[PDB]
Design an enzyme around this catalytic site. Structure first.
Site, mmCIF file in Angstrom:
data_model
loop_
_atom_site.group_PDB
_atom_site.id
_atom_site.type_symbol
_atom_site.label_atom_id
_atom_site.label_comp_id
_atom_site.label_asym_id
_atom_site.label_seq_id
_atom_site.Cartn_x
_atom_site.Cartn_y
_atom_site.Cartn_z
ATOM 1 N N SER A 133 -6.392 -7.032 -1.664
ATOM 2 C CA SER A 133 -7.148 -7.654 -2.738
ATOM 3 C C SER A 133 -8.070 -8.714 -2.148
ATOM 4 O O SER A 133 -7.679 -9.451 -1.236
ATOM 5 C CB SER A 133 -6.212 -8.301 -3.754
ATOM 6 O OG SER A 133 -5.303 -7.365 -4.297
ATOM 7 N N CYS B 64 -0.374 -9.291 -10.415
ATOM 8 C CA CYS B 64 -0.716 -8.764 -9.102
ATOM 9 C C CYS B 64 0.162 -9.302 -7.986
ATOM 10 O O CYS B 64 0.441 -10.492 -7.923
ATOM 11 C CB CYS B 64 -2.184 -9.069 -8.786
ATOM 12 S SG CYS B 64 -2.703 -8.585 -7.129
ATOM 13 N N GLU C 289 -1.569 -4.574 -10.977
ATOM 14 C CA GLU C 289 -1.966 -4.118 -9.664
ATOM 15 C C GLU C 289 -0.927 -4.694 -8.730
ATOM 16 O O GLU C 289 -1.162 -5.673 -8.029
ATOM 17 C CB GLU C 289 -3.354 -4.624 -9.287
ATOM 18 C CG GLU C 289 -3.857 -3.986 -8.003
ATOM 19 C CD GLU C 289 -5.280 -4.384 -7.660
ATOM 20 O OE1 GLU C 289 -5.484 -5.519 -7.188
ATOM 21 O OE2 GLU C 289 -6.194 -3.558 -7.869
ATOM 22 N N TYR D 221 2.065 -3.868 -5.714
ATOM 23 C CA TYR D 221 2.163 -2.986 -4.562
ATOM 24 C C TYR D 221 3.377 -3.289 -3.721
ATOM 25 O O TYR D 221 4.189 -4.126 -4.160
ATOM 26 C CB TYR D 221 0.910 -3.124 -3.711
ATOM 27 C CG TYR D 221 0.486 -4.561 -3.487
ATOM 28 C CD1 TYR D 221 0.925 -5.284 -2.372
ATOM 29 C CD2 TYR D 221 -0.359 -5.206 -4.406
ATOM 30 C CE1 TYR D 221 0.526 -6.614 -2.178
ATOM 31 C CE2 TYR D 221 -0.758 -6.533 -4.221
ATOM 32 C CZ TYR D 221 -0.317 -7.227 -3.108
ATOM 33 O OH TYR D 221 -0.732 -8.524 -2.923
HETATM 34 C C1 LIG Z 1 -4.312 -2.542 -4.485
HETATM 35 C C2 LIG Z 1 -3.543 -3.104 -3.309
HETATM 36 C C3 LIG Z 1 -3.751 -4.430 -2.930
HETATM 37 C C4 LIG Z 1 -3.053 -5.011 -1.820
HETATM 38 N N1 LIG Z 1 -3.325 -6.335 -1.523
HETATM 39 C C5 LIG Z 1 -2.678 -6.916 -0.458
HETATM 40 C C6 LIG Z 1 -2.955 -8.311 -0.097
HETATM 41 O O1 LIG Z 1 -3.742 -9.017 -0.693
HETATM 42 N N2 LIG Z 1 -2.269 -8.834 0.995
HETATM 43 C C7 LIG Z 1 -1.331 -8.050 1.738
HETATM 44 O O2 LIG Z 1 -0.796 -8.602 2.664
HETATM 45 N N3 LIG Z 1 -1.078 -6.778 1.424
HETATM 46 C C8 LIG Z 1 -1.700 -6.171 0.372
HETATM 47 N N4 LIG Z 1 -1.432 -4.861 0.070
HETATM 48 C C9 LIG Z 1 -0.453 -4.090 0.901
HETATM 49 C C10 LIG Z 1 -1.127 -3.533 2.200
HETATM 50 O O3 LIG Z 1 -2.051 -2.536 1.819
HETATM 51 C C11 LIG Z 1 -0.078 -2.915 3.133
HETATM 52 O O4 LIG Z 1 0.831 -2.101 2.378
HETATM 53 C C12 LIG Z 1 0.725 -3.999 3.901
HETATM 54 O O5 LIG Z 1 -0.132 -4.972 4.533
HETATM 55 C C13 LIG Z 1 1.587 -3.279 4.915
HETATM 56 O O6 LIG Z 1 0.695 -2.308 5.743
HETATM 57 P P1 LIG Z 1 0.805 -2.259 7.245
HETATM 58 O O7 LIG Z 1 -0.286 -1.316 7.735
HETATM 59 O O8 LIG Z 1 0.835 -3.509 7.848
HETATM 60 O O9 LIG Z 1 2.108 -1.690 7.542
HETATM 61 P P2 LIG Z 1 2.746 -0.199 7.532
HETATM 62 O O10 LIG Z 1 3.012 0.244 8.922
HETATM 63 O O11 LIG Z 1 2.089 0.660 6.694
HETATM 64 O O12 LIG Z 1 4.162 -0.273 7.001
HETATM 65 C C14 LIG Z 1 4.567 -0.201 5.586
HETATM 66 C C15 LIG Z 1 5.895 0.652 5.528
HETATM 67 O O13 LIG Z 1 6.990 -0.186 6.128
HETATM 68 C C16 LIG Z 1 8.259 0.090 5.423
HETATM 69 N N5 LIG Z 1 8.694 -1.231 4.903
HETATM 70 C C17 LIG Z 1 7.931 -2.170 4.210
HETATM 71 N N6 LIG Z 1 8.612 -3.258 3.868
HETATM 72 C C18 LIG Z 1 9.874 -3.037 4.349
HETATM 73 C C19 LIG Z 1 11.095 -3.861 4.290
HETATM 74 N N7 LIG Z 1 11.138 -5.033 3.710
HETATM 75 N N8 LIG Z 1 12.213 -3.303 4.899
HETATM 76 C C20 LIG Z 1 12.188 -2.060 5.514
HETATM 77 N N9 LIG Z 1 11.112 -1.233 5.613
HETATM 78 C C21 LIG Z 1 9.976 -1.766 5.014
HETATM 79 C C22 LIG Z 1 7.969 1.137 4.364
HETATM 80 O O14 LIG Z 1 8.339 2.436 4.792
HETATM 81 C C23 LIG Z 1 6.437 1.009 4.105
HETATM 82 O O15 LIG Z 1 5.821 2.128 3.528
HETATM 83 C C24 LIG Z 1 -2.103 -4.187 -1.070
HETATM 84 C C25 LIG Z 1 -1.876 -2.821 -1.451
HETATM 85 C C26 LIG Z 1 -2.579 -2.263 -2.561
HETATM 86 C C27 LIG Z 1 -2.315 -0.829 -2.930
#
Ligand SMILES: Cc1cc2nc3c(=O)[nH]c(=O)nc-3n(C[C@H](O)[C@H](O)[C@H](O)COP(=O)(O)OP(=O)(O)OC[C@H]3O[C@@H](n4cnc5c(N)ncnc54)[C@H](O)[C@@H]3O)c2cc1C
Ligand code: FES
Lengths: 296, 98
Positions: A78, A254, A294, A296
């Site tokens: 966001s 959100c 919204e 997530y």
């Molecule tokens: C509309 C929208 C808005 C968003 N806004 C923001 C924002 O403003 N700031 C922000 O930081 N993120 C936001 N996100 C989330 C962001 O897109 C990512 O999901 C987040 O940063 C994690 O992605 P990553 O690539 O770092 O990690 P990834 O490698 O993708 O890892 C995520 C995966 O790790 C595993 N996992 C997650 N949490 C845990 C846990 N506690 N214990 C065990 N396993 C776990 C799950 O399998 C998950 O699918 C938003 C998502 C959406 C859809």
């Protein structure tokens, strides 16, 4: 049509197949060195090429490829900066990224790919962006409408954008004259995001703004119940309900999905005592764009 | 201009009635069905769902990758039905050769 602002709105000016390559101008950790999980406020350059609006969001494509030699998929974030940005030149866009880190069921410390690629960005680095994305969380046209902003963690992001335009700025086509109510739920004070700012806003116009924090660990209400984002709303449940039935009250939620259950829970009990069952009522609100989620 | 759609939710198995010029997710928030949604624009995997008996239009891909259109995956928030449909909602992927 919609009660939300869709005049100067745009989406998908850039897609995963050919993103806009911005550059990190600023990247700072905005959580105390003693908070459970670091969050970072970062600023990228856009050259005005991404006319996003309050409420929308951009996508990021981390560098490299996963354990398969394939480019990482887009992760959404966001937008935490209002249209003009934290520079006032409509030339930048800011993000509030929480860095993902957990230990798995093997004892291995894992790191989210994108959120970590982001929190490690060094000013000057390229960052691939997509969007603007989303029209659900846009702002209403009515400048005198009430507007409840329920946020948890980095979920404050779109509302921080909202507010920047509502007070820290002056436009010749927009003058907020209603009520802007914010509820931020986080575990610690070292985890509060932009408090100073919401402090200045609470003075720049203390008649139109109203902020309520919910530091779940360092706060309790009646029966020593942990003060949650929704436990805070509990203490106003009466005033709140007397708003959830007026054509100009627009609620916005959100952040970390899960903060949505409690809210409906304290809402069902409140409604299931007056009118229909909360659920069918949320359907009447979403009818006039008054309950936009919204999570997530 | 009104196709039959079946939702094999990890809850039960819905029997909706989604029209043509109307996204599926939207009709789910109508009958009172609760399905996962986030950006609601088609850029994430919050509302993924492996399709089956039927076809749908999801041209506003954005997150829809290569072999995703073939594997059958569907972004319920951005897809209008072009025929009777049977989707397995709440479906997720976070590995498999990754
Ligand atoms: C509309 C929208 C808005 C968003 N806004 C923001 C924002 O403003 N700031 C922000 O930081 N993120 C936001 N996100 C989330 C962001 O897109 C990512 O999901 C987040 O940063 C994690 O992605 P990553 O690539 O770092 O990690 P990834 O490698 O993708 O890892 C995520 C995966 O790790 C595993 N996992 C997650 N949490 C845990 C846990 N506690 N214990 C065990 N396993 C776990 C799950 O399998 C998950 O699918 C938003 C998502 C959406 C859809
Ligand atoms: S709600 Fe985000 S892709 Fe469907």
């Amino acid at each position: 049509e919609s009660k939300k602002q869709e005049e100067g709105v745009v989406t998908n000016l850039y897609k995963p197949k050919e993103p806009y390559v911005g550059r990190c101008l600023l990247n700072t950790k905005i959580t105390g060195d003693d908070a459970p999980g670091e969050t970072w406020h970062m600023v990228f350059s856009t050259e005005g090429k991404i006319p996003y609006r309050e409420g929308q969001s951009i996508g990021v494509i981390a560098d490299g490829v996963d354990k398969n030699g394939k480019p990482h998929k887009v992760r959404l974030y966001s937008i935490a900066s209002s249209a003009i940005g934290d520079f006032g030149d409509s030339k930048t866009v800011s993000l509030c990224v929480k860095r993902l880190i957990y230990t798995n069921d093997a004892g291995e410390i894992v790191k989210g790919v994108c959120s970590n690629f982001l929190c490690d960005l060094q000013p000057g680095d390229n960052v691939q962006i997509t969007g603007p994305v989303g029209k659900e969380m846009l702002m209403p046209k009515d400048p005198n409408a009430t507007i409840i902003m329920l946020a948890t963690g980095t979920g404050i992001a779109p509302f921080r954008s909202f507010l920047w335009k509502m007070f820290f700025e002056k436009h010749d086509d927009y003058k907020f004259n209603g009520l802007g109510w914010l509820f931020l739920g986080v575990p610690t004070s070292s985890s509060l995001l932009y408090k100073e700012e919401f402090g200045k806003m609470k003075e720049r116009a203390p008649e139109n703004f109203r902020v309520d924090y919910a530091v779940s660990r360092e706060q309790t209400n009646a029966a020593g119940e942990r003060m949650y984002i929704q436990t805070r709303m509990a203490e106003y449940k009466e005033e709140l309900w007397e708003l959830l039935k007026k054509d100009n009250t627009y609620v916005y939620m959100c952040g970390l999905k899960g903060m949505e259950k409690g809210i409906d829970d304290i809402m069902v009990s409140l409604a299931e005592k007056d009118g229909i069952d909360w659920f069918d009522y949320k359907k009447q609100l979403k009818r006039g764009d008054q309950w936009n989620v919204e999570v997530y | 201009a009104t196709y039959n759609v079946k939702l094999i939710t990890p809850e039960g198995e819905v029997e909706l009635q989604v029209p043509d010029d109307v996204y599926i997710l939207d009709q789910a928030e109508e009958d009172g069905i609760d399905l996962p949604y986030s950006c609601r624009a088609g850029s994430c995997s919050s509302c993924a769902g492996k399709v089956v008996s039927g076809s749908v239009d999801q041209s506003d891909q954005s997150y829809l990758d290569d072999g995703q259109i073939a594997d059958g995956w569907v972004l319920t928030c951005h897809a209008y039905p072009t025929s009777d449909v049977v989707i397995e909602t709440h479906k997720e992927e976070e590995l498999t050769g990754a």
